[PDB]
Chain A
Amino acid sequence: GVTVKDVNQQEFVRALAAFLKKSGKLKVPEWVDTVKLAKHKELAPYDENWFYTRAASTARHLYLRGGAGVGSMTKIYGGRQRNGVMPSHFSRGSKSVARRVLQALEGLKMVEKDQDWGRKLTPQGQRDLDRIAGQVAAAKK
C-alpha cells in the first residue's frame, strides 16, 4: 500500500484532475470561461478545464494540512504582481475561485467544514486521494 505523500505531486494533480473530470459532478460555474484567476495574472489560463486542476490542487493541500479556509487558499496560490513600472509585490489569488472550489469539493463529498472554521478532507475524499496515489505509484513502473 501507498499514500499521496509517497507519490510525485506534479503528476498526482494531473491524475486527480482527470478523476474529478471523469466523475462529471464537480459543478463549474458559468463564468469559468471568462474569469482570470488573480489580479497578478495577465491572461485567462491556457488549459480550458482549469477548475478541475485547481479542485485537485486544493484537495491535496487540504490532505497535507487541515482547516484551510478561502483566505488561506488565495495565499497558497498567491504570486508576484508585476505592478508595471513600480517594483513587483506579493499578490493573493481570486477569493471567488478558491470559494467555488471549496463548495465543489464539498458538493462531490470530498471535504467538509472543519471545526474552528475552514475545510478538511472527509474519509471518502482521503480514500479517493490514496487509491489514485496507488494508481500513479503503479503507473511509474
Chain B
Amino acid sequence: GPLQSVQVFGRKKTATAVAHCKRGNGLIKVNGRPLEMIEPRTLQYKLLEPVLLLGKERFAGVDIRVRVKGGGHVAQIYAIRQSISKALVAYYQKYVDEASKKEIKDILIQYDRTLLVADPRRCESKKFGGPGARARYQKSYR
C-alpha cells in the first residue's frame, strides 16, 4: 500500500556509495550483484560486518540496492560498508521506533565507529620543493 524508501550514502576517501532501502525480501546487492562476489575477495567479511553483527532478521523486511562511485577498491568497500548500515539505521529511524534503531546503531558503533561516521581524512595536497605533501627532495651540500 504505502511507499517506504530511504536513499542514504556512505563516504570514504573520494568514494560515494548510495544504499537505497525499500520493503520486500532479504537481498542486499551493490550495482546489482550479490555481496559474496564484489572484488576484492580479501575484504569479504568487511561487507558482511553489518550482515553478521545484526543477522538477516534485521535485513529480512528490507532489500537494499547500492551504487558505488569514486575512490579505489578498498575505499569503495568502506563506502558500501558504511552506506547499507547508515541506510538501515535511517530505515529503522523512519518506519519503526527509535528503540529498534538505537539497539542497531549501538551494535554498529560499539563494534566499529566507521560504520556510521564518515572518516574525514583526504589525500593532503602536494607542495613544490618535494615529491609530495611533506617529503622534500635530497638536499646536496658539497
Binding site for B on A (CB under 8 A): 5-9
Contact = CB atoms under 8 A, between A and B. Distances in A.
The binding surface of chain A is classed by DSSP as helix
Contacts of B130: none
Contacts of A6: 33-34
Contacts, number: 7
B32 interface: yes
B52 interface: no
Nearest to B32: A5
A1 B117 CA distance: 38
Nearest to A5: B33
Contacts of B32: 5
A129 B37 CA distance: 18
Contacts of A9: 37
Contacts of B37: 7-9
Interface in B20-52: 32-34, 37
Nearest to B34: A6
Contacts of A5: 32-33
A138 to B, nearest CB: 16
Contacts of B34: 6
Interface string B99-133: 00000000000000000000000000000000000
Nearest to B37: A8
A6 B38 CA distance: 11
B99 to A, nearest CB: 36
Contacts of A8: 37
A7 B37 CA distance: 8
A7 B70 CA distance: 24
A9 B33 CA distance: 11
B131 to A, nearest CB: 13
Nearest to B33: A5
Contacts of A7: 37
6 contacts: A5-B32, A5-B33, A6-B33, A6-B34, A7-B37, A9-B37
Nearest to B36: A8
A67 B16 CA distance: 26
B103 to A, nearest CB: 33
A9 B37 CA distance: 9
A5 B37 CA distance: 9
A92 B32 CA distance: 29
A8 B32 CA distance: 13
A21 B141 CA distance: 66
A6 B37 CA distance: 8
